[PDB]
Design a protein around this nucleic acid. Structure first.
Ligand SMILES: [Mg+2]
Ligand SMILES: [Mg+2]
Length: 52
RNA sequence: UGUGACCGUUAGCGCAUAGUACAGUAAUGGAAGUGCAUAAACCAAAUUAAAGGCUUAAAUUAAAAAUAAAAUGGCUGGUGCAAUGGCACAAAAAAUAAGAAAGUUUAAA
């Protein structure tokens, strides 16, 4: 009940980031760290989300 | 699901299901128990041994088979054999991480 328009918008915009891909559909780069536009992994084609 | 110079009912998980019966006010602790068959301890019964004189010369056999005490009655559940139970990891899958903070990245045709 303690929700406003901003609270609903923020929850929706952050939900996509809380859904993670399968560990079997990701390949880790060697020594790469999170940065501006760079991730420590690359995705295989048509990656699937976690089962649970 | 896969494999074993891992176990085979005092073994292997506490459990061949049981965290049950039971102990405790409580937290808690925690069993026994598969199927078949002359094993042991254990209790009753079981002592001994005698025998002294028919006159003997022409049978039998398809074939085969058929005369001899290693072990009393019990109670108990070891040993031997088997597995609808356990132990260890392996393969596959699953779970899992973010830099930022109401803002943009990672998309194979
Ligand atoms: Mg036995
Ligand atoms: Mg046992």
């Amino acid at each position: 009940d303690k929700f406003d328009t901003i609270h609903y918008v923020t929850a929706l915009t952050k939900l996509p980031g809380l859904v993670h891909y399968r560990g079997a559909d990701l390949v880790m780069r060697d020594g790469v760290q999170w940065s501006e536009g760079v991730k420590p992994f690359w995705q295989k084609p048509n990656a699937q989300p976690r089962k649970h």
